[PDB]
């Protein structure tokens, strides 16, 4: 068969570019204003500030390493880069997403300790640095198997044909090659459990405990409302991406349905996830009261 660069009409394509660009900018501005206050303030080096800075770093890494590449893959027919860039992009995107999620979990842990256990000793800065190191290391090795094996195989059924002079080029796909589907299934399952199930369960459990212990004032209602908002955001923003992953991994989807979902709602799921990553520093720096000094 054949395929063409600039896959579809310029209207919806430009809509995709405008939306993704929006997320990017929002992410740039929020993360920059979050990071600038931390470095400029020597005294703002407490444990919670360190965790917020780590979240900002992870969100910047998510943004500038995931949104551009994902936009190009959804705007250029086929995979337009090489194998080394393929491995690098996959590794950095996965590590960044995992680090952002685990930094959210660590922030929830720090908040949980401050309320339900007020008399326990406060976490030391060395403990915060150790926790950050474990977060980064766990993010590295959770999906290292997905990064060691990516060899940018090409397909021969169709041709890129470019956009000028109908220059035929091989179509490239950066899909991983599991020797069979069993380890594909189990790996996607453990990734699901370790990125969405366990982190969301931990966050909601500690936030529920915080609310329960807090209910035992006017501004306290603001605190519980903010916690509920954060938890519901982490549910809703990441729900569709993992839902599409789950549906496209198991069950039995016909090629037409798989094509339509991949080209229509999968970019929407990525947009939601990147919006979550871009709004994380917004809320964690603006709704954070000691930042508003």
């Amino acid at each position: 068969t054949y395929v063409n660069y600039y896959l579809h009409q310029p209207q919806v394509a430009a809509i995709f570019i405008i939306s993704y660009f929006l997320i990017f900018f929002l992410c740039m501005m929020g993360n920059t204003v979050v990071c600038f206050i931390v470095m400029r303030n020597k005294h703002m080096h407490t444990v919670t500030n360190l965790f917020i800075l780590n979240l900002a770093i992870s969100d910047l890494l998510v943004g500038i390493f995931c949104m551009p590449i994902t936009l190009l893959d959804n705007i250029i027919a086929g995979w337009p880069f090489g194998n080394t860039m393929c491995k690098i992009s996959g590794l950095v995107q996965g590590i960044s997403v995992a680090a952002s999620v685990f930094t959210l979990v660590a922030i929830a842990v720090d908040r949980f300790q401050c309320v339900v256990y007020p008399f326990k000793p406060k976490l030391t800065i060395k403990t915060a640095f150790v926790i950050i190191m474990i977060i980064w290391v766990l993010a590295i090795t959770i999906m290292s198997p997905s990064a060691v094996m990516l060899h940018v195989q090409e397909e021969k059924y169709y041709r890129v044909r470019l956009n000028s002079q109908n220059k035929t080029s091989p179509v490239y796909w950066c899909r991983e090659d599991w020797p069979n589907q069993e380890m594909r299934k189990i790996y996607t399952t453990v990734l699901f459990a370790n990125i969405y199930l366990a982190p969301l369960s931990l966050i909601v459990i500690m936030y529920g405990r915080i609310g329960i212990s807090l209910f035992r004032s006017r501004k306290k209602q603001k605190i519980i409302k903010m916690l509920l908002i954060v938890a519901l955001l982490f549910i809703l923003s990441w729900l569709p991406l993992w839902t599409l992953m789950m549906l496209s991994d198991y069950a039995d989807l016909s090629p037409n349905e798989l094509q339509i979902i991949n080209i229509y709602i999968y970019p929407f799921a990525h947009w939601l996830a990147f919006g979550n990553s871009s709004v994380n520093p917004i809320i964690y720096g603006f709704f954070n009261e000691n930042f508003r000094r």
Binding site: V3, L7, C66, T70, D73, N74, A77, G78, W79, G90, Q93, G94, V97, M143, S146, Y158, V171, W173, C174, R175, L191, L241, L258, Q259, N262, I263, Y266, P267, H270, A273
Partner: peptide
Amino acid sequence: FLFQPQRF
């Protein structure tokens, strides 16, 4: 075509 959004 484009049936590969890839992990994240």
